[PDB]
């Protein structure tokens, strides 16, 4: 149940993660409980926040930096600090606008990419319609 959450891109939040799994797995040692394995429990917050950034990069291309606080369960300073570090890793890309009007997750796309995608679309349509026409014919015999 723990891992199924993380292998999928899912909306989730930290005091949901914390509240469920604190009476479960802080009673078992290694990564959790202890006094030194609480610096390994401390690490899980970072990762829950980070799983969300990965979701939010994919779905949103623009979200408000204030709406994003609400999602991550953070103050504004921390929301930034995490975005910056995850981009350093290169796991996501972003650009933050600092008065918190926008954070836009992507690198801006090259002009050539956009056009190559449009050629790809058209070719699939023509392939569809051809095949559809031959399946129309067979169905006249059936009918």
């Amino acid at each position: 149940s723990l891992v199924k959450l993380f292998t999928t891109n899912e909306l989730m939040r930290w005091p949901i993660v914390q509240k469920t799994y604190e009476p479960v797995l802080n009673e078992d040692d290694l990564a959790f409980g202890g006094e030194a394995n609480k610096h390994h429990w401390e690490d899980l917050q970072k990762r829950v926040i980070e799983h969300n950034l990965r979701v939010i990069s994919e779905y949103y291309s623009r979200i408000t930096l204030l709406r994003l606080n609400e999602l991550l369960d953070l103050t504004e300073s921390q929301t930034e600090t995490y975005i910056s570090d995850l981009v350093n890793q290169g796991i996501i890309y972003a650009k933050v606008n600092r008065p918190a009007k926008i954070v836009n997750f992507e690198k801006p796309k090259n002009s050539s990419q956009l056009l190559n995608e449009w050629s790809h679309n058209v070719d699939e349509l023509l392939e569809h319609i051809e095949t559809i026409g031959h399946l129309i014919t067979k169905e006249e015999i059936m009918h």
Binding site: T8, N9, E10, L11, V55, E58, Y59, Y60, S61, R62, I63, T64, R67, K101, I102
Partner: protein
């Protein structure tokens, strides 16, 4: 692929009918509600009290009627705790079903969150949760701007078909037939002689 041989009794036919509805109501990726309505098993099995309300639940999903769905569920979720212990999926199912149908019938593939608030009958925070859930199942692909408050859809997952739906798909081709025809007639007219 079921046999013409008869060795399935009415009990089994009804037992399966019930289970198939249970799977769809408590599912998260079953929009084959109409498929049950277009197979004899469940379409013609309404002939017990259990299959009065159940058939209406499958019908509620197709039309996007929330009020009817809630009234039937309100009674039954208690009686049967299989609905009770799986409720979250069950109420969110009709919101996801209405979400995919709205986008379908339009020729512009974007909805305001404000339009979704009205149509799925959720507050504005929970409209954003609905979008997130749908993309996570893989129903839809596209992008979100929260700063214009839009979700702009680029791809829709295929779904059941019905007479209504055919006319909706047909009209769009009528325009494109027309556009292709007159575009080609004008290009024909220019460089008449340059078809060597």
């Amino acid at each position: 692929t079921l046999e013409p041989s008869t060795s399935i009794t009415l009990a089994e036919r009804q037992q399966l009918a019930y289970d198939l509805s249970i799977s769809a109501l408590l599912g998260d990726k079953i929009y084959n509600f109409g498929e049950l309505l277009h197979h004899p098993i469940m379409e013609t099995i309404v002939n017990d009290s259990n299959y009065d309300w159940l058939f209406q639940l499958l019908n509620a999903l197709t039309v996007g009627d929330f009020d009817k769905f809630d009234s039937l569920i309100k009674v039954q979720i208690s009686k049967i705790p299989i609905l009770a212990q799986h409720e979250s999926f069950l109420r969110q199912k009709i919101c996801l079903m209405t979400l995919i149908e709205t986008v379908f019938v339009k020729n512009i593939r974007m909805l305001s969150f404000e339009d979704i608030s009205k149509a799925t009958h959720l507050p504005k925070d929970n409209v954003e949760h609905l979008v997130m859930r749908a993309i996570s199942l893989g129903l839809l692909k596209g992008s979100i701007d929260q700063v214009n408050e839009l979700v702009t859809i680029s791809w829709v997952q295929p779904r059941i078909i019905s007479g209504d739906q055919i006319t909706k798909m047909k009209d769009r081709l009528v325009e494109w037939n027309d556009q292709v025809e007159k575009l080609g007639k004008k290009m024909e007219a220019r460089g008449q002689s340059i078809w060597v």
